């Protein structure tokens, strides 16, 4: 298991950045976002050849510990042995995920909870940098 | 509280930077890095207006739950109301902090840990950005 990071009280319009490396065998790499390991508004998940999956990720969100319905998307900017920056922030109806190159993806606010308190990384993807904005 | 993460998983020579903004009105902010909140290598405590002190840094471990023999630097490069960034590395027998100024402290390793797992925030320091080498 990855980075793991609490109490980080960020509140919608704010932006949460984090860049990391992603392995060159990597085969899935996670994003969690929420109160807690419970509690997850986004469960950001590109999967390169995972669970019958090919390159698509896989968005799903988890609310006292029941998975909610998974949502896919099919464009995949996503390269093994590579370094990859998401932006990341909410509002009353969406989550957004912001890449540089102009990639957005919208997963539905669920849990519409008043701030994200929890993020942790999971799978082939070692974090080099978090910001708060 | 402030910012906690853990899983940092990082070892001796890699470097821990953390950057964030003192308040104006800062009285102590705290670092505390190590396996968890009873077994610190460094409890990282510059004091501005708390427990009597006047700008100075205060530097402890925590071991078991217990406080170590406390140590003091006379220097104290930081300003109420300013932007503050730190970098921490460690080796066997010293963890090293770089300052702002370039002012650089060595901290006698006391629980000599494979890796530094864990690091907690507190006070008046609001982390802008957490990065690793
Ligand atoms: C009913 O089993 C579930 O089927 C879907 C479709 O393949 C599958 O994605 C899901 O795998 C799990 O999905 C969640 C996100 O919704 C997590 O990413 C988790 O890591 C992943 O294991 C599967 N449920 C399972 C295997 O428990
Ligand atoms: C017995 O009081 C202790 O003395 C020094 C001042 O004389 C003071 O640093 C210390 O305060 C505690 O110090 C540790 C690190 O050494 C932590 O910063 C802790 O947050 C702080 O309260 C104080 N010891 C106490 C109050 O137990």
């Given at each position: 298991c990855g980075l793991v990071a609490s109490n980080l009280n960020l509140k919608p319009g704010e932006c949460l950045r984090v860049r990391g490396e992603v392995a060159p065998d990597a085969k899935s790499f996670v994003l969690n976002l929420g109160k807690d390991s419970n509690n997850l508004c986004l469960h950001f998940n590109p999967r390169f050849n995972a669970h019958g999956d090919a390159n698509t990720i896989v968005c799903n969100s988890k609310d006292g510990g029941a998975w909610g319905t998974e949502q896919r998307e099919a464009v995949f900017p996503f390269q093994p042995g590579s370094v990859a920056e998401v932006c990341i922030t909410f509002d009353q109806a969406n989550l957004t995920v912001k890449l540089p190159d102009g990639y957005e993806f919208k997963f539905p606010?669920?849990?519409?909870?008043?701030?994200?308190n929890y993020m942790a990384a999971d799978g082939d993807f070692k974090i080099k940098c978090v910001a708060f904005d």
């Open positions: 606010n669920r849990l519409n909870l008043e701030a994200i």
